[PDB]
Design a protein around this ligand. Structure first.
Ligand SMILES: CC(=O)N[C@H]1[C@H]([C@H](O)[C@H](O)CO)O[C@@](O)(C(=O)O)C[C@@H]1O
Ligand SMILES: CC(=O)N[C@H]1[C@H]([C@H](O)[C@H](O)CO)O[C@@](O)(C(=O)O)C[C@@H]1O
Ligand SMILES: *[C@@H]1O[C@H](CO)[C@@H](O)[C@H](O)[C@H]1NC(C)=O
Ligand SMILES: *[C@@H]1O[C@H](CO)[C@@H](O)[C@H](O)[C@H]1NC(C)=O
Ligand SMILES: *[C@@H]1O[C@H](CO)[C@@H](O)[C@H](O)[C@H]1NC(C)=O
Ligand SMILES: *[C@@H]1O[C@H](CO)[C@@H](O)[C@H](O)[C@H]1NC(C)=O
Ligand SMILES: *[C@@H]1O[C@H](CO)[C@@H](O)[C@H](O)[C@H]1NC(C)=O
Ligand SMILES: *[C@@H]1O[C@H](CO)[C@@H](O)[C@H](O)[C@H]1NC(C)=O
Ligand SMILES: *[C@@H]1O[C@H](CO)[C@@H](O)[C@H](O)[C@H]1NC(C)=O
Ligand SMILES: *[C@@H]1O[C@H](CO)[C@@H](O)[C@H](O)[C@H]1NC(C)=O
Ligand SMILES: *[C@@H]1O[C@H](CO)[C@@H](O)[C@H](O)[C@H]1NC(C)=O
Lengths: 325, 168, 168, 168, 325, 325
């Protein structure tokens, strides 16, 4: 007798999915929505390459630590790679004010142009040729100082005079700049370097005012210094002018950065991974992803277009039917 | 399976049927074999594809966590940032893991459903002219050649022309 | 459609039927016309209304974004605030856009299913006393007046009183 | 109910049937009574159990709000913290309240489906040897004793040995 | 022979919906859940009207810039509309400390009552009627000063004596008040105005203490001033007392606001939209919404009860069946 | 005729559930997923006991208010219960700097060990035996001072000499410690206590520097004090050293806490609920929860592993069939 039957597809598939009603269900066709593969390296993005701070910290780089000469000058970057146990940062002991807001502001950028903001010329009646210390050595001179700052002291002869400096930002770009205030360990060194008198460091901009006086005290020795420097930063906006004025204890700005900010969003990666000559559209702290998948369980930190991060190990959607072969 | 057809009053599928998801086994004097129903298969493919692409499309945003550091005097906002980023992570993880679980359940139902409707399509034509056997199959009470086999598959059988022989 | 009834082994709908969502079209010696099934229609209206109102009710909260400005030394909390506000926006956008996609799929399924269950209730009463024609319709093999048409619609037919009947 | 079986072309349930969710009520010369179908009931139990445990499992995280105080100069982060915590609260509240509403709708559908598939399993065996009556019941056109009642329940009826009498 | 058929509704609808399985599906009945239309204006809320800050910034309004006289006195508001190119703010150059927390605290309110907190009488042996400047003109006197502050200077031939003032908040309402500290451009002007000696400005409250000294330096010219004023604000809570004491450089509080804070949430809208004589239950930064719809794609910033904001352009739920006509 | 029928279970259940399609639906079996019961008390968590600050505030406890001797010494805690109207806190009027970050850091801990960080010995040529006040009484001496601090003053007729102190944290644990700076109400009392001359208080560690000078002014009377003390705290990390140096106005550290804080989650509960001798795995601000349920509408604040908090009053999942009896 003639037979006709109704039925459905099967194959040698063993790929399983889960449902609310049943776990481990074999189906004929499925699709994985989640990526968990990664090249373990850093690649360029928008073909712009990252900035490897190597054996420097952001602090070291942007203050101009002598041992960070490698990084000196102009820099372009798609993102920033800080290695976890980089040793060259703040050589001469002291606190960098608003460090976290600085590390974040720098992140929001993509290029800097180094430029002499205040020539040593600027400061009248003072010795800009000393201002050097073994807490801050180079690789060739075990007594140096930051490349973007000047430690101004009194001349052999005279009195530490009132000193003034001004800079009108006539350019199109905001300027990131730095200064400091020296806090000697005792009165003896205060007098040697800057002289008698109540000393001050004052700064001014259309939008901000800074003022501080030296805080003299011996503090625990760090790199053989029981003195300190309080470091500061700011952003001189386009059109604004900066006025400096002090009668002592000023670590003056010397070089500064013309800062162009990205309206992407940048990133600062603390990692051990190598930087290699490759492109990428998605780069995570733990590696680049190459995929069209919409989910990923690698890492929640990235730049570029990455898939949504989740804690699933698999997200497999069933497309075919139950497999019964 | 919820419609009862797949695994099943029709236990097991056909590895022999390669050209589709749902279809027919025929056997007659002229031979035998397997043939998919592409209309029901294709509109299923379009369905599932649209489902997958919809899910993909609707899931096509990303929450973005961030580098930023916090001082020892910033435990509170620090922890606030941590709680927020974990918060969205746990939410999206839930949304994705459960959506998969749900849609997979309903996807199987659809296939189950489409098979059943094929079974009843054929049963609606043959009637008296066939013995069921209640497992997807149909024994003809008459002689069904290949033009008759297509008759059943294109949904144009003709119960009148084989009523004669079926009684007998 | 998943249950097979709407568009369909019952191809096409009835603009003529104005008093409901599901029902009957009869033809006999006394006349012809269209009549909705209010029990299945009303029980559907209550369902869908409750579904819509439920969704509305459950969606009746609002995340509230905020005025507040942040200084040039507040890039971090500033950006934290935007990331949070965008975060909830993207979540609720997903929840709403996908819910609509899902429930719309299931809403159609529901109408499909309740048409089918109407089709099968009638089919369960008539049996041999009608020839199917496999498109929602039923040819009576006997004489069905208007009291007989209501017979079928109120679910109290009487297969015996018409077994004389379809004999031929 | 979406599959049409529960409340229902099978109006009402059986308080008499205590050993399961779905099953049979028979009456013959030897007596009458109620007997559950464990296979269909048990796989329903495992299904629902897996669903519940899945929901529980997928919901097994907690967003946790925090002690922390904020000064009169910290109105902004303070309010940010409040908006965030209320934000996740409103999200998880939605996800839970709606999931319940949805799954409850689908849970009932499942039971409805499992009854229907029992109904059609039996119908597939009894054939003509029973008159339907379209309410879950089956009148035998022949004499069905108790092992005959079990024949039907273990799915080995026989159409074979009762055509003879189906005639009559 | 007689016919009975089963079937379903149809109509002249062409309204479509989307499903997971199928896009653009015509149905017989549907409902739109998302609002996207808006009257582009600002309206009354709980029938309290907003506060239109003129050509003011909040700063100008609340410190009492002469050109902000329109806004002087008591004020009630459901919210606050600040215009994007408002010109009268801080006339005399300087920084308003914790500006963002102030702009936010003001937002949290619904009325203020202006009142003389410290009469010029309060300050002994000093001149309270000079204290006026061309950086801060009126519309009729091109040399004036803030209406809630007093620029106190020494009399012509005497010395700037210790001056003291106290105020006990015996009322039920918190008081928002303001002061400042003058920072002259050089020593010459310091001596003109206050005499010399180390000057100070000190304040005290059961819960707070303030103390600062003048930081003398020339800064970039703003409204022809190379001097500066650091402005400050605070809230004297009910029951507490405020003590003022200075020997120079004090810009003293004069008037202040009895502040009544909101129980709802406040708002500060930066916009160009007109304020008109209408009510509303939902007012967004880009316009009022009139609807019962539960979703809306206009804006996430509002006050009153608005629908949930989403990025969808449509959210239409199907209620009827597929239309096959 | 013999009949066999298909059907479904029913029972005496009246328990109802909700669906998208139908509210109040009676079913045969269901399960409640949401807990709303709570023992209204505080219990041990992981057998660890809470710390009842009783009639002290955190400030009072950790500064060593005399009336807070009950809490003196070593302490272990699961969380911290501060009662809402505790009256012993900062006895001598003044602000505790970064109070919120301190209250948070302490919360981040589980035990402290009290220890003499700076013996009174440490300070040469000064009277460490007075430095006591009626604003800070004991229960037995109506004029005392904090137990973790020393109010150092001049000896009868010598002058307040430079005083120095150092502590090397050689232990494995961070040290939480405290100091202050006295701000006299006038010049007369300044000279009584510390002598004339511009005074200072300076602190130092490898990672931080502190320096401030007395701000002399009369401020509103609190506990009969019109002077003030600015209190400060810090954490000396393991390996770090602290240098103290002043010539007046120093409220010196005396005792401090070896702070061990694990990777908990910590809590500080502001509540009146009793602490009783019970265990618990989930403890909320408003009570302990005992349940296996995955949801709960009691409170969003807890420690231990609690169910997810939601605003639902019920979350009942249907397991059985529609009940039709
Ligand atoms: C004079 C000068 O500018 N730097 C000198 C410093 C500073 O006097 C101290 O760092 C201040 O405490 O002392 C030394 C040193 O540490 O290297 C020599 C160095 O030239
Ligand atoms: C000497 C001392 O340590 N405390 C004394 C205080 C304060 O020193 C000053 O009043 C500063 O306001 O003054 C008195 C008082 O009425 O409280 C008595 C008390 O003995
Ligand atoms: C599985 O069967 C497929 C049918 O598509 C065949 O092509 C393939 O080679 C087989 N593979 C294995 C591993 O058995
Ligand atoms: C399927 O079951 C196997 C063991 O039977 C298990 O190892 C595997 O993890 C299960 N699938 C998933 C996705 O977990
Ligand atoms: C469309 O149908 C409605 C009734 O549903 C009717 O009122 C309206 O006039 C119709 N439109 C046209 C153009 O006929
Ligand atoms: C239907 O598709 C058309 C394009 O064919 C599109 O213009 C329209 O927006 C779609 N409908 C909806 C509701 O999105
Ligand atoms: C403020 O005034 C009230 C008088 O009603 C008084 O009780 C309170 O002590 C006063 N405060 C001060 C600091 O004088
Ligand atoms: C800065 O330079 C421009 C002219 O190049 C001028 O408009 C402005 O006055 C200058 N600013 C100052 C403070 O000199
Ligand atoms: C409900 O039914 C149970 C059996 O399931 C029975 O033992 C009990 O007595 C009944 N009680 C109530 C309160 O209905
Ligand atoms: C069920 O409805 C009744 C009133 O009919 C009401 O008292 C009860 O709160 C409702 N319960 C649920 C779970 O919906
Ligand atoms: C602290 O002690 C260790 C070991 O005793 C020593 O190596 C270190 O130099 C000391 N620190 C200071 C600042 O003396």
């Amino acid at each position: 007798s003639d037979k006709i039957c109704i039925g459905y597809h099967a194959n040698n598939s063993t790929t399983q999915v889960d449902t609310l009603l049943e776990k481990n269900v074999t189906v004929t066709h499925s699709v994985e929505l989640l990526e968990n593969q990664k090249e373990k390296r850093f690649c360029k993005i928008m073909n712009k390459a990252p900035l490897d701070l190597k054996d420097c910290t952001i602090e070291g780089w942007i203050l101009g630590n002598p041992k960070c000469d490698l990084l000196l000058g102009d820099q372009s970057w798609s993102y920033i790679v800080e290695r976890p146990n980089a040793q060259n940062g703040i050589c001469y002991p002291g606190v960098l004010n608003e460090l976290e807001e600085l590390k974040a502001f720098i992140g929001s950028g993509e290029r800097v142009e180094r430029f002499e903001m205040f020539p040593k010329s600027t400061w009248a009646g003072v010795d800009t040729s000393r201002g050097v210390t073994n807490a801050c050595p180079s690789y060739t001179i075990d007594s140096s100082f930051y490349r973007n700052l000047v430690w101004i002291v009194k001349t052999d002869s005279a009195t530490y005079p009132v000193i003034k400096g001004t800079y009108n930002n006539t350019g199109t770009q905001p300027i990131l700049y730095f200064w400091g205030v020296h806090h000697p360990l005792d009165t003896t060194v205060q007098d040697n370097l800057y002289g008698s008198g109540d000393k001050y460091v004052r700064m001014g901009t259309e939008s901000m005012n800074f003022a501080k006086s030296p805080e003299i005290a011996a503090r625990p020795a760090v790199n053989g210094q029981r003195s300190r420097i309080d470091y500061y930063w700011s952003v001189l906006r386009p059109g604004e002018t900066l006025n400096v004025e002090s009668n002592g204890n000023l670590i003056a700005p010397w070089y500064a950065y013309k800062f162009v900010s990205t309206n992407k969003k940048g990133a600062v990666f603390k990692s051990d991974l190598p930087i290699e000559n490759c492109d990428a559209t998605c780069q995570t702290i733990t590696g680049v992803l190459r995929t069209n998948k919409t989910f990923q369980n690698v890492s929640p930190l990235w730049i570029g277009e990455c898939p949504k991060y989740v804690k699933s190990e698999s997200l497999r959607l069933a497309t075919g039917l139950r497999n019964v072969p | 399976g919820i419609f009862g057809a797949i695994a099943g009053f029709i236990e097991g599928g056909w590895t022999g049927m390669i050209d589709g998801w749902y279809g027919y086994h025929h056997e007659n004097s002229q031979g035998s074999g397997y043939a998919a129903d592409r209309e029901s298969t294709q509109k299923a493919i379009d369905g599932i594809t649209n489902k997958v692409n919809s899910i993909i499309n609707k899931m096509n945003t990303q929450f973005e966590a961030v580098d930023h550091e916090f001082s020892n005097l910033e435990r509170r906002i620090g922890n606030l940032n941590k709680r927020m980023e974990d918060g969205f992570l746990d939410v999206w993880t839930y949304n994705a893991e459960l959506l998969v679980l749900l849609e997979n359940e309903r996807t199987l139902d659809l296939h189950d459903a489409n098979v059943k409707n094929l079974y009843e399509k054929v049963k609606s034509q043959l009637r008296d002219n066939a013995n069921d056997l209640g497992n997807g199959c149909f024994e003809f009470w008459h002689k069904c050649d290949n033009e008759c086999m297509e008759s059943v598959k294109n949904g144009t059988y003709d119960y009148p022309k084989y009523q004669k022989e079926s009684k007998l």
